[PDB]
Design a protein around this ligand. Structure first.
Ligand code: NI
Length: 341
């Protein structure tokens, strides 16, 4: 059945709740972003109103074939009325089209649902600054102090410099980047820009990227693999066996692969700086795991919450075990005592 942390009190609304069948009492289903654990259940047979960003609504129409009459895209940073309730969509700094949702309840309560987000100080100057938030539905993916990672800018600088050096030393090297969902497009697009190449990919993945309103995208991507020296493949194929096989398909154009796996966190972070990252190598294949995150680090999360000062926090991630739930609640209390709210 639908868990309580997917329901918005005082409304008929749910958030990211498409896999439970007809939720009793639900008049509007919101979708924060186009990732499968959140959209699970949607299809061309869905006949209730879906509220989302313009980019998410492009993906629902083109990839899942949801009918247009049930897609209700909303502009960002704009007060809108849905079934008699004022709502605002804010940029979540996650993947393309991802939003946070502010709900202004008829009784005066204000609720923020972060969806999935990477907290940033720029959020402290949005429409959130303008009123008090009483309840926070929080993406707690990395809510423990072991989770540190570098800025997205530091990670992309590492990736660009590594790829440029490799291909300048060997003009017959191929760069490969893994993917299994939308997000992290900066990784492959920044590398193709430094090399003077388009990114080559499958027709299915090209279709998906063409839904994202990214500027000048026709200039950066292609389905012609032959004309490209940066290839995108499924994340599952980013291993020695999968890469050796791909290199065979390129007909002797290339004699070396340099591959990137943009993971979330991995425990090489507790010790290793970005400067000190090294690949796994076999023969003429090297694989780099880079810590490019689209979720908050522990410290980024803690700064946002201590700024916002909510009266009540409802976690939406890591809620399935008692030890995780109790640990998170202990951090929330530390934060509140340290900041004085
Ligand atoms: Ni996500």
């Amino acid at each position: 059945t639908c868990p309580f942390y997917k329901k918005i009190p005082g409304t008929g609304f749910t958030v990211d709740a498409f896999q439970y069948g007809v939720v009793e009492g639900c008049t509007a289903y919101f979708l924060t972003h186009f990732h499968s654990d959140h959209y699970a259940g949607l299809s061309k047979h869905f006949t209730f109103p879906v509220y989302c960003s313009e980019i998410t609504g492009n993906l629902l129409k083109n990839k899942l074939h949801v009918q247009e009459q049930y897609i209700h895209p909303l502009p960002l940073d704009t007060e809108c009325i849905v079934n008699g309730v004022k709502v605002v969509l804010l940029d979540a700094n996650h993947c393309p089209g991802a939003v946070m949702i502010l709900f202004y309840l008829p009784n005066g309560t204000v609720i923020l649902h972060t969806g999935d987000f990477r907290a940033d100080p720029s959020m402290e100057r949005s429409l959130l600054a303008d009123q008090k938030v009483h309840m926070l539905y929080l993406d707690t993916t990395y809510c423990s102090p072991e989770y540190t990672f570098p800025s997205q800018q530091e990670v992309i600088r590492f990736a660009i410099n590594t790829a440029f050096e490799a291909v300048t030393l060997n003009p017959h090297a191929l760069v490969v980047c893994g993917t299994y969902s939308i997000g992290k497009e900066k990784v492959f697009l920044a590398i193709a820009d430094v090399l003077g190449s388009k990114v080559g990919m499958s027709q299915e993945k090209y279709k998906t990227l063409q839904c994202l309103n990214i500027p000048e995208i026709n200039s950066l991507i292609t389905t012609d693999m032959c004309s490209s020296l940066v290839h995108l493949l499924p994340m599952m194929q980013i291993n020695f066996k999968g890469l050796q096989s791909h290199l065979k398909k390129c007909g002797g154009k290339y004699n070396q692969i340099l591959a990137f796996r943009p993971t979330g966190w991995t425990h090489s972070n507790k010790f290793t700086r970005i400067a000190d990252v090294i690949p796994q190598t076999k023969g003429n294949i090297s694989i780099y795991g880079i810590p490019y995150s689209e979720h908050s680090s522990y410290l980024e999360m803690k700064r946002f919450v201590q700024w916002l000062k909510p009266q009540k926090i409802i976690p939406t991630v890591n809620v399935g075990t008692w030890k995780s739930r109790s640990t998170m609640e202990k951090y929330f209390r530390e934060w509140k005592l340290e900041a004085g709210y």
